[PDB]
Amino acid sequence: SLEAIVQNASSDNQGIQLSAVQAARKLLSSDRNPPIDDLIKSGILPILVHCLERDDNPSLQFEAAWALTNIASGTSEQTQAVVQSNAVPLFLRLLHSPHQNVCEQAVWALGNIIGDGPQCRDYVISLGVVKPLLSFISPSIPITFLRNVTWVMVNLCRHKDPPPPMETIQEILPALCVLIHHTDVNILVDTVWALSYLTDAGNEQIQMVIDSGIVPHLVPLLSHQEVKVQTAALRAVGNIVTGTDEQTQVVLNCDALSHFPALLTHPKEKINKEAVWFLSNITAGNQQQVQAVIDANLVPMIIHLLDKGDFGTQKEAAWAISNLTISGRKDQVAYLIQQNVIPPFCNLLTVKDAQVVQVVLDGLSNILKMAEDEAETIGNLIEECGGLEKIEQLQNHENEDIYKLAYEIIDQFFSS
């Protein structure tokens, strides 16, 4: 029983301790619903943390580390009970254990703690976890251990309120630059996800990732054989192109757009959607970035998805079309018209998502304003597909930004 285990674990004799801690570990590792709360309420935590100090019994340190790992794998309340028992400094000590199993289990426990949230992450960082963790990365490290190191690196990079300290990012990026050349799929997935958390952290963090030199190693993973790697890379580069035009151009200069036909035609609708989101952030750029999308032969594929994709993908394609009109030239917008954008675009005017309706009306207004003389040809195309009747109906929409624009479009372009 738990009472018994706690009684034995509190003994001064390390072999009685070992028996008890192994029994607790087995309770916590034998199925996917361990009795975490019962073990916390029993009072075992400070005892287990005390066991971590016993360099004279590495088996006891290992068992205690595995037990605490699994308690910390639970809810935030369970992880925080481990942290409140002073586990973190003792695990950081065990990163220097001569015993491989103890060191690896300490890494794993710290991963669960760091993963709980940003303040917990920042406590562990402040105590110096990053340097010894990255010191493990070597040619001789066993691959299972390296996979766990890289997973902890994800947890160091994630969570955004606040993001991890700049100095930590500066320490982690050279290690990610090494790991991105690994061939192991699990290492690559984690490495790229860690990068994607950094590129979502803000424009200064995007710039740090760019300045590391890693982007040309990241872009070709869009065509990796493993779909998990491809989509991690799509997130990582996608976050970069939420930045400035110059930051976006770093990604385009790696020929990123040549990787997109196989993502836009991918069987998985979620990948189509994610790919079109990326492209919508390209077409929001300057005229040269708009032209890059045209020259990669992607516009017909976007328009196909606008018409025949799943609704989630259609919404993204609507953004890609409207955003082109921000800085696109008259001739680039004319190309959209020639590619039969107007009917599937207008078909989104009636949906219940007011954000999409606004995007489409904004793009139609910009298209009409840009076609100085051709405004009548385009107006006729909008009328022909029922787009004009749909705009007239939007004069009765709930949302003022929508209905105002519907009145204005009809007054400016259909009141002759």
Binding site: S29, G111, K228, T242
Partner: peptide, 24 residues
């Protein structure tokens, strides 16, 4: 409200777990 947009809800849902138990 045209322009660049951050990653949207529901995208990239297969993120690495924050926490993992060692199970036998």
């Amino acid at each position: 409200c045209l322009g660049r947009r951050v990653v949207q809800p529901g995208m990239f849902a297969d993120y690495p777990p924050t926490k993992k138990a060692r199970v036998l």
